[PDB]
Design an enzyme around this catalytic site. Structure first.
Site, short mmCIF file in Angstrom:
data_model
loop_
_atom_site.label_atom_id
_atom_site.label_comp_id
_atom_site.label_asym_id
_atom_site.label_seq_id
_atom_site.Cartn_x
_atom_site.Cartn_y
_atom_site.Cartn_z
N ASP B 49 0.84 -1.19 0.00
CA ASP B 49 0.00 0.00 0.00
C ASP B 49 0.88 1.24 0.00
OD1 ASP B 49 -1.97 1.88 0.20
OD2 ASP B 49 -2.69 1.26 2.18
N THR B 82 -3.80 3.47 -4.50
CA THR B 82 -2.67 4.26 -4.04
C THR B 82 -1.47 4.12 -4.96
OG1 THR B 82 -1.96 2.46 -2.58
CG2 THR B 82 -3.45 4.12 -1.66
N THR B 83 -1.19 2.91 -5.44
CA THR B 83 -0.07 2.67 -6.33
C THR B 83 -0.43 2.80 -7.81
OG1 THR B 83 -0.48 0.28 -6.30
CG2 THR B 83 1.04 1.17 -4.66
N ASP B 376 -10.52 -1.17 1.63
CA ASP B 376 -10.49 -0.21 0.54
C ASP B 376 -11.56 -0.51 -0.51
OD1 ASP B 376 -8.43 1.08 1.80
OD2 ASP B 376 -6.85 0.22 0.54
#
Lengths: 506, 521, 486, 380
Positions: B49, B82-83, B376
């Site tokens: 993450d 996020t990535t 998430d």
């Protein structure tokens, strides 16, 4: 201190020659202490100019001489094979296996390979003088040698070999093959399309006094050779040189060959009597001059014997590559073999790679004539995959400690198909199942199935992975593979036999 | 102190950016790999993450910490990817470096990216779709598969699909001036081991982790009208005047429990342990006592069951009493053994209905990743129901939008078209990075996918059906597949806010000119 | 990875030549250990004296040395292309793309490029421009594309008349050699129809030398003339002088210098003689007067003595040189440079030697195309449409080579001070909706047609440019490792 | 960094696995440790070895938590299972850092390997009835052969088998055996025991109170079982719980998996020869990393050969030929390093012993492959 130390040097050189072989292969730059820059993909020339400080890895360096004398081609294949056999044996060393079964394992599998080469041979077709046969031999060299253009270079060699061909059709029993019969000349400038072939041999020299042709003379003649008191030596030489040069001109000798120091007084009469002379012939040119022309190099400065003289039907001293050059160009009818091939290129380094590629093409004819025949083998790595199924079968047929050596001996064959994938940047894991898809589970009942008939050719077909090698005429030399496994086994067992380095008074 | 200016600072900004950008490159995509971090305390944390990595990541470059705060703002606004978003700051700032060394003025780079993203909404309007999407039989499962990207849950996402969908089904309520939304972040997640992923149970209610003191109490309550009380005060033994105070304080505790017994509360929630004095009053009154409760979990109980926490018992006068308005309501209370412990299950609450999720994994390091990955995914469905517009997944969005920018650059023209071409090549790193993690070729699928979208805008009727245009990409087999057969899609709000939040993020790196380092005290 | 480190060292090679592109280009100053000042635009002399570190720098030198045979001029707009192809290929080499696809795709792009260059080259012949026109009107700006901007108008009316005497199928570069005369003017250079060389040595009768000959005869002799012993040495030299007079040679060229005895004998009879004759000047006389070189007096015969129309003694720059006129066979016209600056003499020396290459290729085939860097723009425009359907990944590979040709208009705007983006937008419409021939115009500082501009360039320059940059760029990709001993 | 960081992680588990190679079997060796404080710990159990040693390699720290999971089930002989996780990492050297094989491709091959392993586990399945007390007696005595309590186990192991069956019964058969309360009395003889059926504190037979220095005796008649152990020495009570309280895993494993597998590291012999045969039928890209797992399976039985002082290359030639041809019931004698089969060896282990061994090994191996690199200095 040796095994782990040598493998570190082996993996270095093995990765170097890994990118040399193949149509996607790469070259390298080598600079000596004098600043000479040489670009070639040949492993024998590579390790020759390089300075290696590790005596242990030098076994593979001197092992190239055995391959150059016997054949002269497949040098990159030997260094990759011999280097991989010592890399796969590192696992057996960590397992605690002694070198006794390792050396015996390679020697036992070496005799099994020679038995399969006679069973797996195809494409006899046995034709010496066909122009298509000369194309089938010279085409596959694009893997180890320069792959740049195979269209023009294959045509010039085929016309040159057929020009120097002894003929003697049916059984002539022709000994004494001529390796020097093929010669190339490096000319700076121009493209490859400007290159051509000449019925005679050429060399780089420049005319001075005459430059005239003189070949129109209808069987002309050529000769070959090996205070008042101060004027006694001056006038003495002027009378002798005049008499010696006049008797030569009286016999009608248009050109002479002088292999010794020529003074100023000698060249003075040559311009008046119209006699051509060669300036400082080298050692290899002097031997080719007396054998082709058939004249005796009489050391006597006087009139040579008119009975034995040289003859050239048609020769021209005019420009070739843009500068006037006197050459040996001739016609096959009245004079013997050893013609040449003129090359044209902008880069001098590219002409050197073509020279080494043509020199290896001479060995292709040597491999056909000297033994019963050169036969054929599946090219582009298709021979190794045929051996993997055979060597794996021999592991179950001979139970014992050799199964560990037989296993690593078959795994070492994976570097040949990896060479095509690594040099082309493609994933070897994607092409690997396409290589096994040829033989599938077992071989079909038909003779010469897609395993033997087809092969690996990657251009746009990388997705398919298989391609017919018959139409592509991609094949491997049999005499090279027989000598490749012999040098690789002898070199691999030699490194394993090394115990300690000894220095005597140094 | 140290003062250095010039173009070497911008070259150092992208140098430190590309150094930390390699962290999220290997973790991108469902096939992405995790990475281990050493906390120097003797333990370690393995996480892919970007929000957790950039928080712990040590960056000695002042501009490198800007990307850390960017991922923190995207957690509240989006909550996933996020990535798959922040990673664009690598090549986007790298392609701008070539423009800085040239004569291109920074404003042209700034205004070039603003006009590109402003008109990109019209380009996105072509790939939008309603919330119904296909003929059905798969509704919230397709959006639940969006979390497969950048995470490893795609293997077990088959059984976990119905778990996430049904967890948010009964939590419906009315808020936001009458809007129907799901109050996420309120779902309780329990850590457990054993069995497999298919054995995970979904609790349509509240689950409490504690230990019952007396097993003779009415653990399981049958029937409705169950009253639950919540008290923040601690009732237990606590500090011949010493013995007299102990007797007076004991009578005060028994008086406060008597007010709870008179209210008829079946479940009494206490913060700390319960002494033997209160246990005797609970058995005679048939009341199940509960101890060791967390204050954070009690806040959700007040909204769910309707039992307000009591800070202290008092009123305008000096009288201490417990009002009946602080009692909760639910349908039933069932207690079963969950992972070597007995947990209280509160289902069918009156005021608001919640949901709990029980997960299984290998070790504690696996549950930490499986919890945040599914946590998430709750925001993915939440943000999708807010705006019905959805876009197809598989990385085909970045390759398609870059083709429309080619003709859009010719429309604007002048010097602003060069920044558009560099912005199109910057978005090409997303499909190429996925090919690296998939052990495939980069430009193989990129050159082919752009070929289908090249003639996509050239089709007059859309000739017959779709010969070229299509959406979705297969990373496993390395082929172009349709979005219906692949079954992958992404929310539009996540894709729009991706480059929108990164707009001011990348320009902030470009606005940096003079770097000054002041020596510390 | 090893190639990238080798490219960055080779990038600075053409980045030092970066401003030198175009007629507005600059020059590079080189000072060797002998303090020899060399200022020239041509990179051949630059790369020859440039210190090399990595062997890849010698690759561009070997192509530059071979560039004289292929083209010979425009080296600033050619060698720079070898570094640009490897500059934009860096992102592709870092990815899974192998350098073989770059080399294989390059030959596919050149095969399509040369096909279009031959299409752009058009030979009308018929009633259009002929000799003395194509070499003047169309060759006005074609001969010198870099230097001689102010003096261009002088050489068009002079140097063109000198190369007109050179017939096709001969193309002799041995007789086009020039000389260095200090002082004078550039436009005042006199045309020489015969062999002319320096005296290099002063005579006591330098002012008494014969002015002109009606029927001079040149004889080349290598006999060294230098002085009981006194009577013997003086008689032997005297007997050699009488045998030369028997041939009736008014001009005697001696390789080694002569003493006072040979000078006084030739001065009384008004016989001209010149010593310290170089070996290169003797071969020039053989191809002009048609004489022969006699080592001694034994074989000397009267028929070996050649002759020419007339002889003249020219005095220029406070020094007198030998002047031959009306040679029996002369394929060119000897030109003598002038001026007081040595750098200017060497500046135009490289330019005039590059201008004869155009006359050489024009006599074989007469062809002109649009100049000013507009050739690569039309080729790059066509490669964008074809490469989309050609062999998969080759789309992005050829497009990289298509964008690599964009460096030429970017360099022309750098010297002129224009915008690199503004010229691309105007040419993109000029090479698509504006057909082809519209180029860039430096004079009016805008975009215009090169057909009405009168500026053209031979298309044969661009043909050999890709071939010269073929093995140059392929050698960089084909070498993945470099080893230097010690 | 990248592939270089994974190399240090492979050698981290390889160095730890090489220490526990000699920790398996009745011939298991011992290891001596030296801490910076000067204390020495000499023991043959790898449980306390991993706890006391603080490793600087972050990858080796994950094996400490794995040992706690393996010791939670059985704890005897399951410590060496970590070797299997270390051999797979070393097996990827020709593949991961050479052929550039993607980790998920290896993990996907391990998923098919773990699935095919359970099929081989069901192939060596040998069910046995649990009603026979003599059959269950020799079963718990399997782990006793590594101790000197063998001849003492006659009056010891009989108390454990009878107490578990009371708290096991059925429900499946899943139940809680933790209700048993074991009391240890120091001093006396190990042969002296206490047989009590009931709860230790309707129509009760008798009530009496004995004399014990610890506490008194009380009987509670129910409508649950306790054990009172009298040790033969003072500190021997620590080893008594290892041979009785820790031996309850054998009684738990036979109820969950009544089948029997070859004991003493003889199970994976038939697994390695069978895994190589199942690889030839795959015929795919993953075949090479899938077939290479069998090369990591044969490294475990070599620990017995290293303990028996034999040659693992030459001995396994005939040993692997017996499992791949004759039958899968053959085994290896760990004591003398002999070919004597497990039939006459008299020791058999439940299938779940190898099930939980391979399951926890594959799950721990893939997590180590999913780690690209390791960074430090975050200052949390």
């Amino acid at each position: 201190g040796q095994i782990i130390k040598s493998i570190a040097a082996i993996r270095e050189l093995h990765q170097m020659c890994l990118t040399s072989m193949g149509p996607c292969g790469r070259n390298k730059i080598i600079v000596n202490h004098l600043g000479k820059i040489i670009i070639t993909n040949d492993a024998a020339t590579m390790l020759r100019e390089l300075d290696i400080v590790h005596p242990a890895v030098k076994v593979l360096v001197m092992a190239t001489e055995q391959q150059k004398i016997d054949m002269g081609d497949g040098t990159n294949l030997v260094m990759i094979l011999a280097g991989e056999l010592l890399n796969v044996s590192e696992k057996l060393i960590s397992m605690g296996l002694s070198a006794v079964e390792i050396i015996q394992g390679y020697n036992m599998a070496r005799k099994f390979t020679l038995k399969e080469l006679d069973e797996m041979v195809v494409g006899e077709i046995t034709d010496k003088n066909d122009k298509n046969e000369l194309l089938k031999m010279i085409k596959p060299v694009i893997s180890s040698k320069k792959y740049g253009s195979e269209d023009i270079l294959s045509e010039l060699v085929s016309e040159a070999v057929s020009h120097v061909l002894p003929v003697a059709q049916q059984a002539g029993e022709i000994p004494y093959f001529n390796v020097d019969s093929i010669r190339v000349v490096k000319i700076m400038g121009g493209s490859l399309s400007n290159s051509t072939v000449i019925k005679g041999m050429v060399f780089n020299r420049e005319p001075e006094g005459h430059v005239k042709s003189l070949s129109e003379d209808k069987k002309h003649k050529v000769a070959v050779f090996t205070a008042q008191e101060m004027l006694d030596f001056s006038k003495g030489e002027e009378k002798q040189i005049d008499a010696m040069m006049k008797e030569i001109a009286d016999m009608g000798v248009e050109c002479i060959v002088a292999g010794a120091g020529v003074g100023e007084l000698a060249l003075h009469y040559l311009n008046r009597y119209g006699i051509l002379v060669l300036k400082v012939p080298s050692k290899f040119e002097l031997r080719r001059l007396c054998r082709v022309c058939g004249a005796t190099p009489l050391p006597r400065l006087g009139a040579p014997t008119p009975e034995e003289l040289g003859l050239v039907e048609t020769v021209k001293t005019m420009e070739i590559g843009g500068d006037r050059v006197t050459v040996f160009k001739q016609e096959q009818g009245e004079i013997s073999r050893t013609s040449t091939i003129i090359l044209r290129g902008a880069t001098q380094n590219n002409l050197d790679d073509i020279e080494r590629a043509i020199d290896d093409g001479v060995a292709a004819v040597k491999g056909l004539m000297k033994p019963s025949g050169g036969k054929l083998l599946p090219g582009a790595g298709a021979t190794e995959i045929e051996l993997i199924s055979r060597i794996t079968k021999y592991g179950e047929r001979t139970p014992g400690l050799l199964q560990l050596a037989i296993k690593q001996f078959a795994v070492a064959f994976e570097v040949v198909p990896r060479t095509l994938a690594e040099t082309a940047g493609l994933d070897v894991n994607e092409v690997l199942p396409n290589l096994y898809a040829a033989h599938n589970v077992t071989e079909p009942g038909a003779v010469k199935t897609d395993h033997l008939y087809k092969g690996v050719d990657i251009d746009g077909e990388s997705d398919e992975g298989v391609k017919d090698i018959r139409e592509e005429n991609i094949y491997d030399m049999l005499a090279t593979k027989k000598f490749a496994i012999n040098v690789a086994t002898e070199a691999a067992t030699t490194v394993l036999s090394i115990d300690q380095i000894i220095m005597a008074k140094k | 102190g140290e003062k250095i200016s010039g173009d070497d600072i911008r070259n150092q900004n992208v140098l430190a950016t590309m150094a930390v950008a390699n962290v999220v490159k290997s973790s991108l995509g469902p096939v992405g790999l995790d990475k281990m971090l050493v906390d120097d305390i003797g333990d370690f944390t393995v996480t892919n993450d970007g929000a957790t990595i950039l928080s712990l990541l040590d960056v000695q470059h002042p501009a490198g910490k800007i990307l850390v705060e960017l991922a923190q703002q995207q957690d509240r606004e989006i909550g996933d990817g996020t990535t798959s978003v922040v990673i664009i700051a690598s090549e986007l700032l790298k392609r701008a470096n070539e423009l800085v060394k040239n004569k291109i003025h920074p404003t042209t780079i700034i205004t070039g990216f603003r006009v590109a993203l402003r008109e990109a909404i019209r380009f996105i309007n072509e790939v939008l779709s309603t919330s119904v999407d296909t003929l059905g039989k798969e509704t919230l499962i397709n959006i639940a598969k969006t979390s497969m990207s950048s995470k490893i849950i795609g293997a077990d996402s088959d059984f976990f699909s119905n778990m996430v969908v049904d967890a948010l089904l009964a939590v419906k309520t009315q808020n936001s001036k009458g809007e129907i939304k799901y109050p996420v972040k309120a779902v309780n997640v329990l850590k457990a081991h054993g069995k497999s992923a298919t054995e995970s149970l979904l609790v349509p209610g509240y689950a409490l982790n504690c230990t019952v003191a007396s097993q003779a109490m009415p653990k399981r309550i049958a029937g409705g009208n169950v009253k639950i009380a919540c008290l923040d005060l601690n009732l237990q033994k606590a500090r011949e005047q010493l013995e007299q105070i102990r007797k007076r304080e004991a009578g005060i505790v028994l008086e406060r429990v008597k007010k709870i017994i008179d209210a008829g509360a079946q479940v009494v929630l206490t913060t700390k342990g319960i002494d033997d004095l209160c246990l005797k009053e609970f058995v005679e009154a048939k009341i199940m006592g509960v101890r060791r409760c967390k204050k954070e979990d009690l806040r959700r109980i007040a909204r769910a069951t309707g039992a307000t926490l009591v800070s202290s018992m008092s009123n305008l006068e000096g009288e201490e009493t417990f009002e009946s308005s602080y009692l909760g309501l639910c349908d039933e209370v069932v207690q079963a053994k969950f992972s070597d412990d007995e947990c209280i299950l509160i289902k069918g609450t009156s005021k608001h209905s919640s949901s709990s999720i029980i997960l299984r994994g290998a070790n504690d390091y696996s549950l930490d990743e499986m919890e945040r990955s599914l946590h998430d995914s709750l925001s993915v469905v939440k943000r999708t129901l807010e705006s019905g517009n959805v876009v197809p997944g598989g990385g085909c969005v970045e390759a398609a939008l870059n083709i429309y920018l080619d003709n859009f650059a010719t429309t604007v023209g002048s010097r602003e078209q060069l920044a558009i071409a560099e912005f199109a090549a910057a978005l090409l790193i997303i499909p190429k990075t996925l090919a690296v993690n998939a052990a495939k070729d980069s430009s193989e699928l990129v050159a082919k996918l752009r070929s289908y979208h090249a003639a996509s805008q050239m089709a007059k009727p859309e000739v017959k059906r779709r010969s070229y245009r299509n959406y979705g990409l297969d990373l496993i087999r390395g082929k172009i597949v349709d979005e219906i057969h692949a079954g992958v899609l992404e929310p539009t709000i996540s894709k729009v806010k991706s480059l929108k939040s990164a707009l001011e993020a990348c320009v902030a790196i470009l606005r940096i000119d003079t770097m000054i380092t002041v020596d510390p005290e | 990875g090893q190639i990238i480190s080798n490219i960055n060292a080779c990038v600075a090679v053409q980045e030092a030549l970066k401003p030198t592109l175009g007629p507005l280009g600059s020059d590079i100053l080189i000072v060797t250990s002998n303090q020899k000042t060399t200022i020239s635009n041509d990179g051949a002399t630059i790369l020859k004296l440039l210190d090399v570190v990595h062997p890849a720098a010698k690759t561009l030198v070997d192509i530059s040395r071979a560039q004289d045979a292929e083209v010979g001029d425009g080296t600033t707009s050619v060698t720079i292309l070898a570094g640009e192809l490897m500059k934009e290929a860096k992102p592709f080499l870092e990815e899974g793309i192998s350098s073989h696809l770059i080399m294989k795709g390059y030959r596919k792009a050149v095969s399509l490029a040369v096909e279009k260059i031959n299409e752009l080259a058009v030979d009308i012949t018929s009633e259009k421009s002929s000799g003395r026109e194509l070499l003047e009107r169309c060759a006005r700006t074609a001969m010198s594309s870099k230097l001689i901007h102010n003096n261009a108008d002088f050489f068009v009316k002079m140097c063109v008349d000198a190369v007109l005497s050179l017939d096709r199928n001969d193309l002799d570069d041995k007789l086009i050699g020039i000389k260095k005369i200090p002082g004078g003017a550039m436009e005042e250079s006199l045309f020489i129809n015969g062999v002319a060389f320096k005296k290099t040595f002063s005579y006591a009768g330098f002012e008494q030398q014969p002015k002109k000959f009606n029927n001079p005869k040149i004889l080349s002799l290598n006999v060294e003339l230098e002085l009981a012993i006194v009577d013997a040495e003086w008689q032997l030299i005297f007997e050699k002088l009488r045998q030369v007079e028997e041939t009736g040679a008014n001009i005697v060229l001696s390789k080694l210098p002569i003493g006072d005895l040979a000078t006084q004998f030739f001065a009384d009879r008004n016989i001209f003689c010149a010593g310290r004759v170089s070996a290169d000047d003797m071969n020039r006389v053989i191809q002009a007067v048609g004489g022969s070189i006699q080592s001694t007096t034994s074989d000397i015969k009267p028929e070996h003595l050649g002759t020419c129309a007339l002889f003249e003694e020219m005095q220029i720059g406070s020094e007198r040189y030998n002047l031959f006129q009306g040679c029996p066979q002369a394929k060119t016209c000897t030109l003598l440079l002038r001026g007081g600056a040595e750098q200017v003499i060497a500046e135009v020396e490289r330019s005039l030697h590059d201008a004869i290459m155009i006359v050489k290729r024009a006599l074989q085939n007469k062809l002109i195309v649009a100049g000013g860097g507009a050739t690569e723009m039309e080729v790059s425009k066509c490669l964008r449409d074809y490469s989309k359907t050609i062999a998969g990944k080759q789309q992005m590979i050829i497009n990289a080579f298509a964008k690599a040709l964009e460096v030429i208009p970017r360099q022309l705007c750098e010297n002129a001070g224009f915008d690199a983006i503004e010229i691309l937008n105007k040419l993109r419409l000029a090479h698509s909706k504006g057909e082809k021939w519209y180029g860039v115009v430096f004079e009016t500082e805008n975009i215009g047609d090169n057909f009405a501009k009168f500026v053209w360039e031979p298309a044969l320059v661009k043909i050999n440019a890709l071939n010269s940059a073929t093995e140059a760029t392929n050698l960089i990709l084909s070498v993945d490792e470099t080893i230097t001993n010690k | 960094t990248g592939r270089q960081a994974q190399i240090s992680n492979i050698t981290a588990a390889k160095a730890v696995a090489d220490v526990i190679r000699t920790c398996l079997g009745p011939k298991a060796m011992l290891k001596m440790l030296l801490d910076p404080m000067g204390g020495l710990v000499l023991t043959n159990d790898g449980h306390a070895i991993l706890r006391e040693i603080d490793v600087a390699h972050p990858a080796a720290k994950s094996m400490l938590e794995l040992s706690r999971t393996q010791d939670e089930e059985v704890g005897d002989g399951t410590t060496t299972v970590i070797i299997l996780a270390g051999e797979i990492l070393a097996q990827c050297a020709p593949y991961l850092i050479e052929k550039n094989i993607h980790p998920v491709i290896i993990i996907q091959a391990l998923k098919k390997a773990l699935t095919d392993a359970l099929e081989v586990i069901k192939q060596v399945s040998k069910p046995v009835d649990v009603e026979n007390d003599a059959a269950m007696k020799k079963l718990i005595q399997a782990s006793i052969g590594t101790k000197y309590v063998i001849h003492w186990s006659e009056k010891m192991c009989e108390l454990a088998l009878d107490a578990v069956k009371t708290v096991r019964k059925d429900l499946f058969e899943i139940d809680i055996k933790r209700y048993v309360r074991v009391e240890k009395i120091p001093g006396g003889d190990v042969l002296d025991s206490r047989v009590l059926k009931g709860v230790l504190l309707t129509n009760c037979g008798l009530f009496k109170v004995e004399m014990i220095g610890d506490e008194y005796f009380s009987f509670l008649d129910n409508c649950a079982c306790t054990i009172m152990l009298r040790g033969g020495s003072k500190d021997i009570l620590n080893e008594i719980d290892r041979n009785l309280q820790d031996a309850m895993a054998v009684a738990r494993n036979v109820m969950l998996s009544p089948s029997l597998s070859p004991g003493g590291g003889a199970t994976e012999m038939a697994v390695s020869v069978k895994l190589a045969e199942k690889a030839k039928q795959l015929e795919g890209i993953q075949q090479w990393p899938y077939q290479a797992v069998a090369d990591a399976m044969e490294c475990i039985p070599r620990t017995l050969i290293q303990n028996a002082g034999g040659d693992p290359i030459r001995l396994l030639s005939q040993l692997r030929a017996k499992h791949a041809q004759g039958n899968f019931t053959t085994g290896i004698d760990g004591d003398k390093g002999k070919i004597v089969d497990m039939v006459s060896y008299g020791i058999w282990e439940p299938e779940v012993i190898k099930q939980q061994s391979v399951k926890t090994a594959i799950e721990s191996a893939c997590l180590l492959l999913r780690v690209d690199d390791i960074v430090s200095g975050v200052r949390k």
